[PDB]
Symmetry: none
Subunit: 73 residues, 9 copies
C-alpha cells in the first residue's frame, strides 16, 4: 500500500486593531454579609466568600488556530 499525506496550509488568521482601551472591570464593589449560627457539617467544606477568580483579559490579537493532522494505518 502507498499513502501520501501531503496537505498544504497557506492560511492567514489575522486581526488588525487601531486602538483598544478604556476598559473597566469592577467585581464586588458592593457589600457582602455572611452570618452563620449553629451549623453542623458531617463532611468536607469548600468555601469562597468575596471577589475571587475574576479575570480581565484584553489581548491585542487573541487569535487561535487549532490544527490536528491524524493518520491511522
Amino acid at each position: 500500500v502507498q499513502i501520501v499525506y501531503k496537505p498544504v496550509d497557506l492560511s492567514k488568521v489575522t486581526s488588525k486593531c487601531g486602538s483598544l482601551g478604556n476598559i473597566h472591570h469592577k467585581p464586588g464593589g458592593g457589600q457582602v454579609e455572611v452570618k452563620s449560627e449553629k451549623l453542623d457539617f458531617k463532611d468536607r467544606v469548600q468555601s469562597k466568600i468575596g471577589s475571587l477568580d475574576n479575570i480581565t483579559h484584553v489581548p491585542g490579537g487573541g487569535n487561535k488556530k487549532i490544527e490536528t493532522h491524524k493518520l491511522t494505518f
Copy 2:
C-alpha cells in the same frame, strides 16, 4: 507498505494593534463580612475570604497556534 507523511505549513497567525491601554481591574473594592458562631466541622475545611486569584491579563499579542501531528501504525 509505504507511508509519506509530509504535511506542509506556511500559515501566518498575526496581530497588529496600534495602542492597548487604559485598563482598570478593581476586584473587591467593596465591604465583606463573615460572622460565624458555634459551627461544627467533622471533616476538612478549605476557606478563602476576600480578594483572591483575580487576574489582569493584557498581552500585546496573545495569539495561540495548537498543532498535533499524529501517525499511528
Copy 3:
C-alpha cells in the same frame, strides 16, 4: 515497511503592538472582616483571608505555539 515522517513547518505566529500601558489592578482595596466564635474543627483547616494570589500579566507579546509530533509504530 517504509514510513517517511517529514512534516515541514514554515509558520509564523506574530504580534505587533505600538504601545501597551496605563494598566491598573487593585485587588482588595475594600474592607474585609472575619469574626469567629466557639467553632469546633475535628480535621484539617486551610484558611486564606485578604488579598492573595492576584496576578497582573502584561507581556509585550504573550504568543504560544504548541506543537506535538508523535509517531507510534
Copy 4:
C-alpha cells in the same frame, strides 16, 4: 424617698457601605457680574461675592447618636 435611675442601653447604630465615590461638586463655575454706581450707605455693610461657604461632606459613616439623661429632684 428612693429613686433608681438605671436605664441600660445596648443599641447598635450601624452603617455598612461597599463603595462611595464619583462625587462632583462645582459651585460657581459660571460668570458673576456686580456693577455699582453712586450708592449711599448710611450704616454697616457686609458683602459676599463669588463662591463662598460651599461644602462637600462625604463621611464613610456619618452616623449620629444623641442621648440626654436628665434627673431633676
Copy 5:
C-alpha cells in the same frame, strides 16, 4: 433621700466602608467681576470677593455620639 443614678451604656456607633474616593470639589472655577464707582460708606464694611471658606470634608468614619448626664438636686 437616696438617689441612685446608674445609667449603663453598652452602645456601639459603627461605620464600615470598603472604599471612599474620586471626590472633586471645584468652587469658583468661573469668572467674577466687581466694578464700583463713586460709592459712599458712612459706617463699617466687611467685603469678601472670590472663593472663600469652601470645605472638602471626607472623614473615613465621621460618626458622632453626644451624651449628656445631668443630675440636679
Copy 6:
C-alpha cells in the same frame, strides 16, 4: 441625703475604612477682578479678595464623642 452618681460607659464609636483617596479640591481656579473708582469710606474696612480660608479635611477616622457629666447639689 445620699447621692450615688455612677454612670457606666462601655460604648464604642468605631470606624473601619478600606481605602480613602483620589480627593481633589480646587477653590478659585477661575478669574477674579475688582475695580474701584472714587469710593469714600468714613469707618473701618475689612477686605478679603481671592482664595482664602478654604479647607481640605480628610481624616482616616474623624469620629467625635462628646460626654458631659454634671452633678448639681
Copy 7:
C-alpha cells in the same frame, strides 16, 4: 481743498466666559481601506489618506475686530 479725517473709535468688543471645557474631537477613529489595482496616471497626483488637517480650536476669547481707514485723494 481741506479734508479733515478724524474718525474716533471708543468701541469695546468683549467676551466674559465662566468655564470652557469638556471638549472632545475624534477624527478618524473608524476604519479606512484603499485598494488599488492596475491604475494608469499620465499627469500629476496628490493623495491624502487617513486623518489629516483636523483642527481643535478653543480660544478663551477668540474675538475679532477688523478696521480699515482708507482716504483716496
Copy 8:
C-alpha cells in the same frame, strides 16, 4: 472745498456665558472602503480619503466687528 469726516463709535459688542462645554465631535468613526481597478487618468488627480479638514471651534467669545471707513475725493 471743506470735508469733515468725524464719525464717533462708542459701540459695545458683548458676550456673557456662564459655562460652555460637554462638546463632542466625532468625524469618520464609521468604515470607508475605496476599491479601484483598471482606472485611466489622462490629466491631474487630487484625492482625499478618510477624515480630513474637520474643525471643532469653541471660542469663549467669538464676537466679530467689521468696520470700513472709506473717503474718496
Copy 9:
C-alpha cells in the same frame, strides 16, 4: 491742499475666561490600510498617509485686531 488724517483709536478687544481645559483631540486612533498593485505614474506624486497636519490650538485669549490705515495722494 491740506489733508488732516488723524483717526483716533481708544478701542479695547477684551477676553475674560475663568477656566479653560479638559480638551481631547485624537485624530486617526482608527485603522488605515492602503494596498497598491501594478500602478503606473508618468508624472509627480505627492502622497500623505496616516495622521498628518492635525492641530490643537487652545490660547487663553486668541483675540485679533486687524487695522489698516491707507492714505493715497
